[PDB]
């Protein structure tokens, strides 16, 4: 992947998470489960929807009858007509094929970028209060209940609130 998250340091996808494209798995004393980050998912769904509509709706054609009829003494203009139909066929086929090829690659990179930014948003929030244990997972140095978990997902994690407890537990763990 272009950004390294999908099929990268996050190795696989979650069939268990069904309500969103990008989300979270959590586990605390209150239990575990999957949840989807609604903001990032809806932003990506809006973006891709706009992309598909842009590809479709920018093609606005008028009423037209492609066919033409020529008699046996009009072979040259008949071939001229064929060249026009063929040239348009070649232009549209090649352009359509490459547009799908190139934009499909951009779409997968887009998802890869969205995952990386989501991981980095959390990592920049938790800082040293949690450990980066790989596969997109953070292991906390302080207890993080459901309310604390939602604050991380909401982008409102209070680092100073838990920094002292995490610091003491981190030093004890490392010692």
């Amino acid at each position: 992947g272009l950004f390294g998250a999908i099929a990268g340091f996050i190795e696989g996808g979650w069939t268990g998470m069904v309500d969103g494209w990008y989300g979270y798995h959590h586990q605390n004393e209150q239990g575990s489960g999957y949840a989807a980050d609604l903001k990032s998912t809806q932003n990506a769904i809006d973006g891709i929807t706009n992309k598909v509509n842009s590809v479709i709706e920018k093609m606005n054609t008028q009423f037209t009858a492609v066919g033409k009829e020529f008699n046996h003494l009009e072979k040259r203009i008949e071939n001229l007509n064929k060249k026009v139909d063929d040239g348009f066929l070649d232009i549209w086929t090649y352009n359509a094929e490459l547009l799908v090829l190139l934009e499909n690659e951009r779409t997968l990179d887009y998802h890869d970028s969205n995952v990386k930014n989501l991981y980095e948003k959390v990592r920049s929030q938790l800082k040293n209060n949690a450990k980066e244990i790989g596969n997109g997972c953070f292991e906390f140095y302080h207890k993080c209940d459901n309310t604390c978990m939602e604050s991380v997902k909401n982008g409102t994690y209070d680092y100073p609130k838990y920094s002292e407890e995490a610091k003491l537990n981190r030093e004890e763990i490392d010692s």
Binding site: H72, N79, L80
Partner: protein, 55 residues
């Protein structure tokens, strides 16, 4: 009528062509002044190329 001499000719001659489709007949009729065909050309046209005037 007498035209200005071009290549020492005061008369003029107009040249005509037509393409006869397979199975068709072309008829010539004259009481004079007809420069008849002697050699005709069986041909099959392509998608048109062009003409280059160059040395």
């Amino acid at each position: 009528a007498i035209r200005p001499k071009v290549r020492d000719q005061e008369g003029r001659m107009n040249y005509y062509w037509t393409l006869v489709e397979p199975g068709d007949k072309i008829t010539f009729e004259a009481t004079g002044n007809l420069v008849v065909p002697r050699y005709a050309f069986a041909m099959e046209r392509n998608a048109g190329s062009g003409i280059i005037i160059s040395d």
